[PDB]
């Protein structure tokens, strides 16, 4: 059933003059200067002012369309700049030497050295986003195709923005339509996810597979036929993998083995291009198609059959759980914040899997050996992936203060988690400290025995070994599966577990990443910093309503700065300060993951292979006996590999060296806000608003200090911007030079 209100709010520019018209206290006017910061925080905080569960949902359904628009604007910005201001057509002629370049700089006051000698006949900034290998995978040959996508995106950008107008200002849906989660999962698995990969199978077979099989032979970008010509001409396509002469007729008599030529299970790297065989990804997305379509006929709708989720959670209850999942379906239909937290966790955690599965199984042609790009899609999606988990911890806490109800949730699983929340945290507290001693303290042991000249006493490979036997048995059994347990696979799932090396050009696409004592030592640091980031974020969710210290933390709101200096001091008791605290730990958690990844590849995995057959890597296998101490981590990774970012002056990398200093600046600026407090900086306004009153021009909006949380929030927002953009500039001006 689809029930609608027709035009609840019309098209007026009249409310645009009143900022804070959505709210109550801010639709009256500012009296201090914090009212700007009081405004600009709680704009898109939709249940802060709105009480109507139906109307608060209609805003969210509209605003997603606008967020769907701004990606499409941004996508067209990639697709438009890919045609005019790129060396893309030249790059398809030669994928090995010429670097992917877009964002050409205007010829002005000195930034015209950033349009360096990149290749082709071109001058621009060498980019590392991999759109060139995403358009070479998509089958794009001419530069006209990149143009028509951009307008083709821009019309979808405009169509999405009109649809957000159409569904709130014109046709607002109701809450009984919103709460139909079972029909929503049926379509989102069926339409979006089932027909997602099926349509991409519908692209990749008829479009990508011919023109990318030809470019492996590499006849010419111009001499490859246009993508519509492989549907018109029946003879032209069936020259290669000749099953199209049989048509859809093996597909319609269930004799599917006649498509063993384009819909296959090759399973390796395409040795000319270093990427995944696009035949497999056609069979992948076809198997993903049928798996998701039959996943979408599962939930109950208005045709009687199906699983209904209020029936499944009930009678999933055991003796160690009491009521089990009674009422947990009633949470996720009644609270957007509980939905956003779970939607965020498996969205960021998903993207870290994308970062892991893209460097070890490179999906794209000439993305693997282009070390400028194969690094930068790991470390970007890892970085996105940690920020969403911190957002998953935030809205989980916001559910606890404002949306969680102990009336409905008696003796079920949110009740029994909250009723043992010390046993969770204190055992989590122990395993945090246990992990810090037995991972980081194994470096301080390793620091000292090298400083004291006792390398028989450190933890190394030629020393007291800490062998990762579980990660070597898993790396063994996955590398000996093509033929035993995966027979129809030709080679393994990846060459990262085991097998021979592969080269494209003169550079290595993939080789088995080995795990010794130095890899055991770093993998527990990851396990340590993830458990602390859990511990900060988990404690924020669990103690969000009350604790032993404050019994009404639920009354003081999600985001309140302190309860004052009482009880010895209660500075940062709120759940928001836990999300504020976990942000640096997620900064600490991920930046060592990147430091593990970007150093392990350069010394052990990436590098230049001889035409004799052996590989000389970039930083030269130093990760074995150098990475076990901090001084080796400082010298041989941080000090040594930053030699190209501070020597970037006078070259086309010179914008990176400014940012490597420019992010060192902002990171220092953030320390001013975290280390200080409000009641100092307020009283410096009092002497200064004295002076602006002194010369008879004082602002009627009287200035005040920033709020303590805004002092906290600007201290972390400049910390991350100062810290990640340092790593952003370091990782760029390292791997553009040596790769």
């Amino acid at each position: 059933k689809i029930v609608i209100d027709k035009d609840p709010v019309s098209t007026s520019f009249d409310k645009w003059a009143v900022p804070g018209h959505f709210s109550r206290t801010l639709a009256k006017g500012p009296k201090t200067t914090t009212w700007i910061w009081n405004l600009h925080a709680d704009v898109h905080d939709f249940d802060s002012y709105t009480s109507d569960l139906e109307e608060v949902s209609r805003k969210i359904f509209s605003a997603h369309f606008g967020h769907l628009a701004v990606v499409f604007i941004w996508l067209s910005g990639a697709y438009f700049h890919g045609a005019r201001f790129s060396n893309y057509e030249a790059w398809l002629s030669n994928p090995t030497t010429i670097k992917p370049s877009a964002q050409v700089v205007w010829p002005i006051v000195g930034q015209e050295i950033l349009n360096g000698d990149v290749g082709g006949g071109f001058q621009g900034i060498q980019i590392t986003s991999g759109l060139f290998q995403m358009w070479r995978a998509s089958g794009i040959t001419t530069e006209l195709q990149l143009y028509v996508t951009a307008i083709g995106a821009l019309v979808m950008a405009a169509l999405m923005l009109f649809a957000g107008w159409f569904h709130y200002h014109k046709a607002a849906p109701k809450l009984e339509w919103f709460q139909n989660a079972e029909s929503m999962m049926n379509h989102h698995l069926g339409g979006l996810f089932g027909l997602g990969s099926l349509s991409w199978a519908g692209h990749q077979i008829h479009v990508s597979l011919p023109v990318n099989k030809l470019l492996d032979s590499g006849v010419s970008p111009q001499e490859i036929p246009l993508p519509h010509e492989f549907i018109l001409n029946k003879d032209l396509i069936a020259q290669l993998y000749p099953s199209f002469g049989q048509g859809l007729t093996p597909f319609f008599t269930l004799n599917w083995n006649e498509y063993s030529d384009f819909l296959t299970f090759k399973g390796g790297l395409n040795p000319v291009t270093g990427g995944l065989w696009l035949s497999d990804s056609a069979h992948h997305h076809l198997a993903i198609a049928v798996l998701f379509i039959v996943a979408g006929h599962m939930y109950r709708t208005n045709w009687g059959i199906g699983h209904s989720m209020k029936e499944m959670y009930d009678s999933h209850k055991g003796p160690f759980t009491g009521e089990g999942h009674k009422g947990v379906y009633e949470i996720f239909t009644n609270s957007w914040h509980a939905q956003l937290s779970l939607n965020l966790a498996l969205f960021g955690s998903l993207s870290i899997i994308v970062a892991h599965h893209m460097y070890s199984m490179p999906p794209y042609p000439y993305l693997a050996t282009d070390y400028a790009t194969s690094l930068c899609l790991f470390t970007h999606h890892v970085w996105i992936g940690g920020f969403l988990i911190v957002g998953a911890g935030a809205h989980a806490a916001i559910f606890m203060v404002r949306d969680y109800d102990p009336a409905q949730n008696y003796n079920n699983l949110v009740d029994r988690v909250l009723r043992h929340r010390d046993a969770i945290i204190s055992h989590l507290n122990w395993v945090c400290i246990f992990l810090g001693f037995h991972s980081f303290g194994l470096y301080i042991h390793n620091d000292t025995m090298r400083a004291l000249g006792r390398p028989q006493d450190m933890f190394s490979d030629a020393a007291i070994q800490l062998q990762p036997v579980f990660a070597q048995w898993v790396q063994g059994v996955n590398s000996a599966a093509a033929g035993n347990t995966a027979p129809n696979a030709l080679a393994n799932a990846s060459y990262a577990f085991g097998g021979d090396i592969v080269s494209v050009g003169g550079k290595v696409a993939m080789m088995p990443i080995s795990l010794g004592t130095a890899d055991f030592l770093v993998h527990h640091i990851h396990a340590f910093t993830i458990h602390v980031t859990v511990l900060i974020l988990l404690k924020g969710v669990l103690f969000a309503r009350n604790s032993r210290l404050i019994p009404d933390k639920a009354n003081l709101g999600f985001r309140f700065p302190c309860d004052g200096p009482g009880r010895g001091g209660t500075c940062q008791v709120s759940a928001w300060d836990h999300v504020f605290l976990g942000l640096f730990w997620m900064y600490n958690s991920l930046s060592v993951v990147l430091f593990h990844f970007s150093w392990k590849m350069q010394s052990d995995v990436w590098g230049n292979v001889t035409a004799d057959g052996a590989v000389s890597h970039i930083t030269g296998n130093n990760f074995a006996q150098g990475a076990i101490t901090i001084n080796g981590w400082l010298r041989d990774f941080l000090w040594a590999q930053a030699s190209q970012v501070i020597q970037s002056y006078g070259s086309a990398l010179s914008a990176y060296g400014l940012m490597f200093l420019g992010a060192h600046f902002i990171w220092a600026f953030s320390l001013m806000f975290l280390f200080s407090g409000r009641g100092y900086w307020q009283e410096l306004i009092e002497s200064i608003v004295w002076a602006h009153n002194k010369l008879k021009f004082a602002p009627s909006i009287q200035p005040r200090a920033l709020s303590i949380t805004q002092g906290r929030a600007v201290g972390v927002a400049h910390y991350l911007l100062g810290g990640i953009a340092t790593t952003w500039s370091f990782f760029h001006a390292r791997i553009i030079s040596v790769g």
Partner: protein, 139 residues
């Protein structure tokens, strides 16, 4: 008068409440009468159930027996609650409402302890009570 034991609400849980301090010094308790079978968030975790009662619950501190009442009276409209602080290991029974009426309301007979008959800039200076045991903020 406490009436211990008054029947506690049917709970079964909470690692977070009434630990070893209660068996060496000064635990607490709160008494009220439940006018339904409604559920409420405890200061420990959340649920108990309000009985007919005679509803007593040995909480941890004073702050939890005060913040329960400011949660009881708003949600469940019950202003009959009668907190305590215990016998032998504790100090004073019936800590609130100390007058029988709620001490947010005004009532004849109370004492004005801790009143300064001045303004706060009208306090003496700490330069003026150097090596003098008179408190600066005290009358």
């Amino acid at each position: 008068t406490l009436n211990l034991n008054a029947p506690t609400p049917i709970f079964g849980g909470s690692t977070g409440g009434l630990l070893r301090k209660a068996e060496v010094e000064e635990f607490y308790s709160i008494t009220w009468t439940g006018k339904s079978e409604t559920v409420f968030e405890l200061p420990t975790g959340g649920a108990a159930i309000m009985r007919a009662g005679e509803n007593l619950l040995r909480l941890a501190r004073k702050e939890q027996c005060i913040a329960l009442g400011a949660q009881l009276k708003d949600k469940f409209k019950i202003t009959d609650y009668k907190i305590y602080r215990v016998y032998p290991s504790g100090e004073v029974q019936f800590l609130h409402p100390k007058d029988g009426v709620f001490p947010e309301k005004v009532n004849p007979g109370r004492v004005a302890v801790g009143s300064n008959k001045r303004r706060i800039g009208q306090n003496p200076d700490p330069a003026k009570l150097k090596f003098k045991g008179q408190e600066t903020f005290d009358s």
